[PDB]
Amino acid sequence: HMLGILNKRTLNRYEKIANDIDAIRGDYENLSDDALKHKTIEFKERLEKGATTDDLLVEAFAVVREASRRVTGMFPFKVQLMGGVALHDGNIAEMKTGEGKTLTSTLPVYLNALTGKGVHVVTVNEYLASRDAEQMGKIFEFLGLTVGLNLNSMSKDEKREAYAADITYSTNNELGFDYLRDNMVLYKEQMVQRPLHFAVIDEVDSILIDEARTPLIISGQAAKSTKLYVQANAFVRTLKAEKDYTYDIKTKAVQLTEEGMTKAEKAFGIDNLFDVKHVALNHHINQALKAHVAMQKDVDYVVEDGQVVIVDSFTGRLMKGRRYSEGLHQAIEAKEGLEIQNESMTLATITFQNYFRMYEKLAGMTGTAKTEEEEFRNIYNMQVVTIPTNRPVVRDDRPDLIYRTMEGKFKAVAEDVAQRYMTGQPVLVGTVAVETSELISKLLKNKGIPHQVLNAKNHEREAQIIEEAGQKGAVTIATNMAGRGTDIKLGEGVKELGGLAVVGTERHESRRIDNQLRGRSGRQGDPGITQFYLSMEDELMRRFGAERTMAMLDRFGMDDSTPIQSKMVSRAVESSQKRVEGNNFDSRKQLLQYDDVLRQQREVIYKQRFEVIDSENLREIVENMIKSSLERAIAAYTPREELPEEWKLDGLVDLINTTYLDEGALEKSDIFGKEPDEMLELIMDRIITKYNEKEEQFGKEQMREFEKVIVLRAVDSKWMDHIDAMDQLRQGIHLRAYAQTNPLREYQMEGFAMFEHMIESIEDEVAKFVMKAEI
């Protein structure tokens, strides 16, 4: 009281803000709905007059907190206010399951939506997106904000409207696909998304760590060309057994030699087969070579009904739908003189990781993220903030039990479930593969135990099951990807029984997943128990330290009769797991360096394309592209040194009359013995008037749209070729790098050169199509 006041801090940033907000709870506690809602108007006026979101945080959060009580009956706990602050700061709020992370997100989302820039609230699937938008939307709407829901089944117009709302719920995949489609648009008005401001990502460790490289692709409705498969096949029939190409015994590796390589360059009229402009041609030759030397008809595959069908080596049985990949199947089709069925072309591509890094601000929520903090910081510039549970956790997380065999492990699992079920205490069995769930389910069926199986196929249906998994007598088997996002509340008389009992059937590649399974139980201080069952036969048990220990326990004489539960063993297993995570992280970091190459090129290309779309006058840009294009053409026929047997032979004449100027427009005009510097300006002048002509003479503003379309088609077309070539370059980078050397550098350098190739290709196309084409 007075002693307290006189004394009145060692509290952290989040506890402080939390108390502040709690301190002014009375200033809204009795305000009127209309008046509480008007607060939104007040906040926007203040932001208009210089206020920041950080300035309004305390009050904004207090407002939402109150609004939540009225709309849902829930008054955000203080730990939730702390979570909201962490998310608002652009970091990850690690909140355990059952802490109400969803209501928590309404705090920073409301705050960051006031400036009318939009806020994306991302969920793993559309069921959760629609549920949350429906339930949480009532709060935002109570406060005068609009809530949108972006679904795959929605048309462009409906999507655009959902994106125009103050807040937009969606899934990681749809947001990415919309982004790719917005960047293939012919008119800026066709886009559906607004600039990417702020995204609040649920299950952020899953999305940005585990599924970070998830590919989002937009394929071409049209088909690729087969001509190159034909030519490549024709060429390969010319080569000899040893001095034209090699062939390893052990592996099916088939490589070309200098003779073959010289022969190829000779045959295809090129100087360097390894030149980035020829990556496709080189890839096709390697595949046709492989098709003739490493693939045998009637042993590897068969030809039936005009098609190549893969033969299962050891059964002799056919695998009708399967196809070899990376063009090898088409190469074989060409070899066998069959109809070549080429793949569809990728028009646009991106990963979860690189899509989200396009946002101005990012926040995330998960009960498991602290361990990956360094990765979140370096990659997404997000820190991880551990948020205290509202109530102490009294869940009893038992140490792993280790059996000698899978059989014993599973039997012990079924036995455990049976005992729990006999008492009525609810049980949830976690598994990693659907095949494992069915293994356990059959064990439970033989014991006459009623139970539910979640395989993560129908989310709405599974959410309904999960919601009842805490009821007396309940027995649920779920694959780690099932039932996510739905709390399991204890039914009447359940806590008295011990709360939810969770049984793990095996350790996951990441401890984060083990703990998410553990977290389904013991919410809000509820009692509970978790137990992982393992065996010496498990994948992890055959790793690092786990290996030597199991070997020792084996010789010691361990049986399934009595499992091992030792702190020494448990820590050795923990050590292996940490090492497994260590290696997975090294791999990720390696893949990040390779992914970064195409990533930067895409951000650049898209940035440029947008400008083309967002431009009224493009002639300057087009003229420059012609300039550059012509300069390369002139330089091509003006050997800066060549004296031997000619000294600048001339063919550029017809090459210009066929590419820029009309047929027979120049030749005797200032072209002869002149200087490259001169020949350039002279020919350009002709081009200008030639452009002025076609411009004003034919069509008025049609010229500006004539360009607009020619440039967009060139960008999109060349970007398409670039993606395919960069993919081939990456797959075969080891063939371009010398042994005892890191291919990453070679990939970076060749990737840079290919990008140059793409720009020059874009300039040439736009050059010809504008100087030689009518609408």
mmCIF file of N, CA and C in Angstrom, residues 302-309 318 320 338-339 341:
data_model
loop_
_atom_site.group_PDB
_atom_site.id
_atom_site.type_symbol
_atom_site.label_atom_id
_atom_site.label_comp_id
_atom_site.label_asym_id
_atom_site.label_seq_id
_atom_site.Cartn_x
_atom_site.Cartn_y
_atom_site.Cartn_z
ATOM 1 N N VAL A 302 10.717 -50.665 -71.344
ATOM 2 C CA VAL A 302 10.209 -51.354 -72.520
ATOM 3 C C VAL A 302 9.434 -50.346 -73.344
ATOM 4 N N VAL A 303 9.197 -50.684 -74.606
ATOM 5 C CA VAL A 303 8.420 -49.837 -75.493
ATOM 6 C C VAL A 303 7.118 -50.598 -75.750
ATOM 7 N N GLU A 304 6.000 -50.013 -75.335
ATOM 8 C CA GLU A 304 4.695 -50.631 -75.532
ATOM 9 C C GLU A 304 3.707 -49.544 -75.901
ATOM 10 N N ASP A 305 2.955 -49.787 -76.969
ATOM 11 C CA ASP A 305 1.954 -48.841 -77.448
ATOM 12 C C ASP A 305 2.564 -47.443 -77.645
ATOM 13 N N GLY A 306 3.676 -47.401 -78.377
ATOM 14 C CA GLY A 306 4.358 -46.147 -78.657
ATOM 15 C C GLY A 306 4.861 -45.376 -77.449
ATOM 16 N N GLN A 307 5.176 -46.074 -76.361
ATOM 17 C CA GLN A 307 5.657 -45.393 -75.166
ATOM 18 C C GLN A 307 6.750 -46.104 -74.385
ATOM 19 N N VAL A 308 7.517 -45.309 -73.644
ATOM 20 C CA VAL A 308 8.602 -45.814 -72.820
ATOM 21 C C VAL A 308 8.012 -46.047 -71.438
ATOM 22 N N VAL A 309 8.112 -47.282 -70.956
ATOM 23 C CA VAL A 309 7.561 -47.638 -69.656
ATOM 24 C C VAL A 309 8.632 -48.282 -68.793
ATOM 25 N N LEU A 318 5.881 -53.803 -64.756
ATOM 26 C CA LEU A 318 5.955 -52.449 -65.288
ATOM 27 C C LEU A 318 5.379 -51.445 -64.295
ATOM 28 N N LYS A 320 3.700 -48.412 -65.151
ATOM 29 C CA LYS A 320 2.995 -47.598 -66.136
ATOM 30 C C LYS A 320 2.973 -46.066 -66.089
ATOM 31 N N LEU A 338 10.187 -42.656 -80.678
ATOM 32 C CA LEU A 338 8.794 -42.488 -80.263
ATOM 33 C C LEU A 338 8.362 -41.029 -80.227
ATOM 34 N N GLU A 339 7.082 -40.799 -79.966
ATOM 35 C CA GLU A 339 6.564 -39.441 -79.887
ATOM 36 C C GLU A 339 7.123 -38.818 -78.612
ATOM 37 N N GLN A 341 7.185 -36.594 -75.579
ATOM 38 C CA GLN A 341 6.199 -35.901 -74.763
ATOM 39 C C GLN A 341 6.911 -34.957 -73.801
#
